[PDB]
Design a protein around this ligand. Structure first.
Ligand SMILES: Cc1ncc(C[n+]2csc(CCOP(=O)(O)OP(=O)(O)O)c2C)c(N)n1
Ligand SMILES: Cc1ncc(C[n+]2csc(CCOP(=O)(O)OP(=O)(O)O)c2C)c(N)n1
Ligand SMILES: Cc1ncc(C[n+]2csc(CCOP(=O)(O)OP(=O)(O)O)c2C)c(N)n1
Ligand SMILES: [Ca+2]
Ligand SMILES: [Ca+2]
Lengths: 525, 525, 526
């Protein structure tokens, strides 16, 4: 068989049936004779291609396949690649390389030193030394992406390899099954269990790897057993817990001092599926107040090694959560009391306060909605005013890289056609990957886009104030008609200048059958 | 406290008490006020420094700490790092960098783009952005090297960082315990054990991670239970099974065809702590023959990803091995029959054959001896003729990089002062790190060095013969006097031109007080 | 044609006839049927292989070809490559890779991510995408090494490539001639010449690239016309100027403050072929005192960019030096004030002071001797006491990496059979590349090795002192017998325990036919 055929067989047999891409001259020899059991998803830009794939991989909890054009295409995606890395997304990035005979002369379309391009934002980057090796390298890439901790990979392949004769011994790759579903040995696990049952005032902290592992329900059972308060690790890329559950305590502020102070009083603090920690703002202080010990359970050796305090276990989050939830005894302590309901902010007949939007989104959206956030100045209000009962109901750019929510909201919706995806994106952030809108329309992927328009970078201006920094240029974004952009890419558009219009626009988008964008006028800071 | 104080406190609390090094100007501010509870092992050149630390780390099954000088020192040790990578040696390599104020002008001794230098032969590579961050980076290096899969790490530290004040929060890293002692979940583990129980003709292949995890005994119990034959994986850097056990079948040849042929007949083949496969010579064919199904247990995701066949499980070798040995049913099949005893080769009163040397060593060395091998052309005869009952009995350069055995043998002897270490080393390979001899004499480490002197790069002449390659230069190394080399570095020397002399020198060396080198006149190929 | 035949044809057509190597299996398909117009130099260890090739490349002023084994052999030589990078040595480093079919499975001997290995110490790292591209790749490596600024390059070749058919169009690369022999345009050169003519108190500073270009004599002319004092840039890897010329000022100490002080009062300071500057010891102060202007002529963009002060011109040192020597006016100023003569140090009949050794070498050695230095605590004294009036008379680890001088002194001597190489090497430094001696014996290369045995890492102890560092481990190296090491590798050995023995040993070694090692008992700094 050919490399072309042997490779499509490898993907098939590994459970791959979708290729998100933007094509070039180097990817043609691979894209040709596109099998009937595969489906192609075009995006007009590479950051969009990878963002859609990303959203898709995270929601489906399975690797996504990507096909990009040489260096220019690989480069245009590296922003999105930055987010994927931080979110442990299993992305198999494949880029086309110039014909082997033209690489030396560095002809146009030649990915020079290709393996180094994506570094250091990838787990594995490689260019095969021969055509016949392609299938095997594809196997490595697939498994390298899928193994815990999950992450994006990169494979460069000359477009002249696809027609070449594949190595018959390649068939051994087809049904290779690699497992990293592992957990702490019985002995050291019983000691951890013992320590948990002996804790007088334990707290729990959950990160994105919990939602990734669909370990959410096990973490609920674990929290209820231990009758422990639950927090989401700072800068959360996902939601690992029910926001209305009695134990839930909200999202931790992304600061050293704020976190140690919040943990003060708790003797044992168990962190699951989160870096320790994902700080953001400057808040020098004590990592942990005396009397508080920390135990981290991550699937990433890099997270475990860099943690400034506490002990760590490197195991699979799905396996560990399940074991712990089924091992720990039921504490007699009283079950924590659910946090009070956020008060309703005063709203006039003019511009809408972000608080009003969320309260409104929470009232009208189906219970199994899926929210994406890239309204940077309103993350706190969002996490508080949005009741998210189910797994994989929240997504936020994991390396803080803007341009992720728009496309990712498309990939998620594609992966979850039964759940209404609602992307909440600031007017600034909506520009980074605006072209992505075209994909939602072309394939009729029914994402509802909510654009919060403050005419500026609320977040940036804020930080500006927390630095007393005056005379900063480039913070305003006036003169952007999001309705016209939506029209440009064939997506139904709507506007809400007030609460009355907001309620109306939302009505009509949940009833609509295709993608819908709503530009909402929000107060300025 | 100073970064200096805090850093040594960290090393100490993490169980490190030994520094293997060759000092430079950028290392003195680190080395000054050397605490009494630490020991410093000086080697004359950096391949020797690392090699010794490698042997030490492998034998002790704990991280070894190394201190080298900037780029030139790190550079000199690169070859040694390639072996360490392949052998998963937990080595924390640190190099002195120019004072921060003089980095910009690239002053003499400035490690340019330092983190990139050792790549790609290290798990992690880093230079802290500030002095206060040194301790934390050191904590990372420590854990990144100890965690599975174990391997060398690299830390570059500007020499002015040591006197600066350390962060008071750094005390949290002192007692951080990180665990990767994990095994497959209960559900999937059951499936595996059932598969092993159901096998009609099982075979077991073992690699170096078995010996490193001291799982040798557990593997012995496993093979006794399944009554299946046991093989060591090709290009073995270690021995993880009694070479006299009834199940032991020896070192697999390092060829694709030869391995698939050996494995023909066995329905299920269990590979533990080894790559699949570490082939060497070009021997094209089938990876496996039909009827054979492969299951691999590895602690390194890189190995699981690049296996061209079989299923893989990524987990700690210790926990996995111990789990399987105490779970599998005891087959009723008849325990395999021990392999015959190598045949005695005809030996005249002249040049000694490698077979004779090994037979004499075996009939004279203590039962708990430890052997290192850098006698390239006689590896096969070595594995057949040495009885190695105990774990940690064999070391061989894991990436084939010559210059390992000699320093490593000193590192091992240092690690195991109660076990007589005997390094067998070709006349060719003895020169790569000849200078390490001095460390053996200086620190009174009684390692025995057997130099197999045939006057030529033997394994090279062999290969050249298989490739029908003619007129190849640089294969002969005449005119080296090893006794004179040993006298040069203060190491007692003896020579064995015949058997009588061999017996006598061996008896004298085993008795001698300090290190001893025997130059043996062997026959050529 | 095979890739093997074509590659060897390219090498000869490019002037290469020597291959410095340590063979491995991956390199055997390359070394086989070794052509009769080529010669192979074996060294027993990689750093020794590269070090010899380095000395050979620097002395001959031509690129040198290297053949090493996969990752491990490349790795062993990376310390030596750090020195070569700093000395702009044109070294073509080739390493054999596993057969293309066994790279994926990462068989033993596989060089993983090979091109990344020697980075950041190479101008170019590459592994070709196919067998037929090898020749083109070797062409690139050859030219990347030879083009200013010259440096080491790296090429990894799967061993199954050598037998495969080469592209017939590969013959176009045979006579390819690349030139970077360039100087500053006429208009901007005139402006520079005017600034030199108009200077009231100009000073000249010269680095290693001057000696590399053989621009020493043009610098002499220039220094004479400008009647300017001449200094060698700090951490000098080579000697760019007659040490006894009336203009010679000596070696600049490697300190910021020391240098601005030495340059005070000079209105214009012209630096040629050196980084600005290769400082060493922490010596904070003013880069340049006010009233002092700096002009740097370098062949390396990296050097011009990183200079903390001054204007820079990136051009060929050979051409720029020649143009300037022949363009400047002759000044009627008086020559620099004569340098004091270095004093004869107090010397008993016991252990030898470095200064006694240097004066004695200077008295007995031929006018055209070549000295290498890896005697780390005696460098300043060496420069004062050795009269080197010829080009290419001095070499010293350019990145400060020990293990250079001994192998390099062999490369140099091979390259200069008519000039007597004298390597002055510390007891510490001698160990990094001890096995190189074997190469001297085998090919009968008459290098003389002077081992300065003081029992200690002298420079370190000194630094420990200038730091007030107490209880530093590992500064002593007792119990090394260098006569034994020499015998071990088949090199004739002598011992100098005092002045009388030293004189006799030097006389004897200067008349010997093969290589000689002299162990000199010197006084310790203690
Ligand atoms: C690609 C990228 N560019 C720039 C930034 C820095 N940044 C963070 S928030 C922000 C403005 C976002 O404003 P908007 O999306 O309108 O939401 P708001 O902050 O107004 O709530 C910028 C530029 C980033 N995180 N990613
Ligand atoms: C650092 C390094 N250099 C070169 C090689 C290639 N090589 C492998 S075996 C060998 C000859 C070894 O000679 P000797 O130690 O005498 O063993 P023998 O083959 O003679 O038994 C060489 C040059 C290597 N593997 N590693
Ligand atoms: C590869 C390498 N290792 C270590 C050093 C640090 N170093 C610089 S000088 C020196 C002392 C060398 O001693 P020796 O050769 O006896 O000369 P001496 O100082 O006694 O004159 C050392 C270890 C270095 N520069 N390069
Ligand atoms: Ca030999
Ligand atoms: Ca010394």
């Amino acid at each position: 068989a050919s490399v072309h055929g042997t490779t499509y067989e490898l993907l098939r047999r590994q459970g791959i049936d979708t290729v998100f891409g933007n094509p070039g001259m180097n990817e043609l020899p691979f894209l040709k004779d596109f099998p009937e059991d595969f489906r192609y998803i075009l995006a007009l830009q590479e950051a969009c291609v990878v963002g859609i794939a990303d959203g898709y991989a995270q929601a489906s909890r399975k690797p996504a396949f990507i096909n990009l054009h040489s260096a220019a295409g690989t480069g245009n995606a590296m922003g999105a690649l930055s987010n994927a890395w931080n979110s442990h997304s299993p992305l198999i990035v494949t880029a086309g390389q110039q014909t082997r005979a033209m690489i030396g002369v560095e002809a146009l379309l030649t990915n020079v030193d290709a393996a180094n391009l994506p570094r250091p934002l990838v787990k594995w980057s490689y260019e095969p030394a021969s055509a016949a090796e392609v299938p095997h390298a594809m196997s490595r890439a697939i498994h390298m992406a899928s193994m815990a901790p999950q992450g994006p990979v990169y494979l460069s392949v000359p477009y002249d390899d696809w027609d070449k004769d594949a190595d018959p011994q390649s068939h051994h790759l087809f049904d290779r099954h690699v497992s990293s579903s592992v957990r702490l040995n019985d002995q050291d696990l019983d000691i951890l269990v013992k320590a948990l049952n002996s804790a007088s005032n334990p707290a729990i902290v959950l990160g994105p790897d919990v939602d990734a592992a669909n370990a959410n329900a096990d973490c609920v059972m674990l929290a209820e057993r231990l009758k422990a308060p639950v927090w989401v690790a700072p800068s959360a890329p996902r939601c690992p817990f029910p926001t209305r559950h009695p134990c839930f305590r909200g999202l931790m502020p992304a600061g050293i001092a704020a976190i140690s102070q919040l943990l003060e009083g708790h003797d044992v603090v168990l962190v699951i599926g989160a870096p320790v920690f994902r700080y953001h703002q400057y808040d020098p202080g004590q990592y942990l107040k005396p009397g508080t010990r920390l135990i981290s359970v991550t699937c990433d050796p890099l997270e475990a090694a860099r943690a400034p305090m506490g002990d760590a276990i490197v195991a699979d989050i799905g396996a560990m959560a399940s074991a712990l939830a089924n091992l720990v005894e039921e504490s007699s302590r009283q079950l924590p009391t659910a946090a009070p309901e956020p008060a309703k902010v005063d709203q006039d007949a003019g511009r809408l306060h972000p608080e009003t939007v969320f309260d409104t989104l929470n009232d009208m959206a189906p219970e199994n909605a899926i929210y994406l956030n890239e309204s940077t100045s309103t993350t706190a209000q969002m996490w508080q005013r949005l009741n998210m009962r189910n797994p994989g109901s929240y997504y936020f750019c994991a390396a803080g890289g803007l341009g992720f929510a728009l496309p990712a909201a498309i990939g998620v919706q594609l992966a979850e056609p039964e759940r209404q995806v609602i992307a909440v994106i600031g007017d600034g952030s909506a520009n980074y990957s605006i072209s992505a809108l075209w994909t939602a329309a072309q394939y009729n992927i029914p994402t509802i886009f909510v654009i919060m328009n403050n005419g500026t970078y609320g977040a940036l201006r804020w930080f500006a104030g927390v630095l007393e920094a005056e005379n900063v240029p480039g913070l305003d974004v006036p003169g952007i008609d999001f309705r016209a952009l939506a029209k440009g890419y064939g997506v139904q558009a709507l506007k809400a200048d007030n609460l009355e219009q907001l309620k109306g626009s939302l009505q009509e988008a949940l009833s609509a059958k295709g993608p819908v964008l709503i530009e909402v006028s929000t107060v300025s800071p």
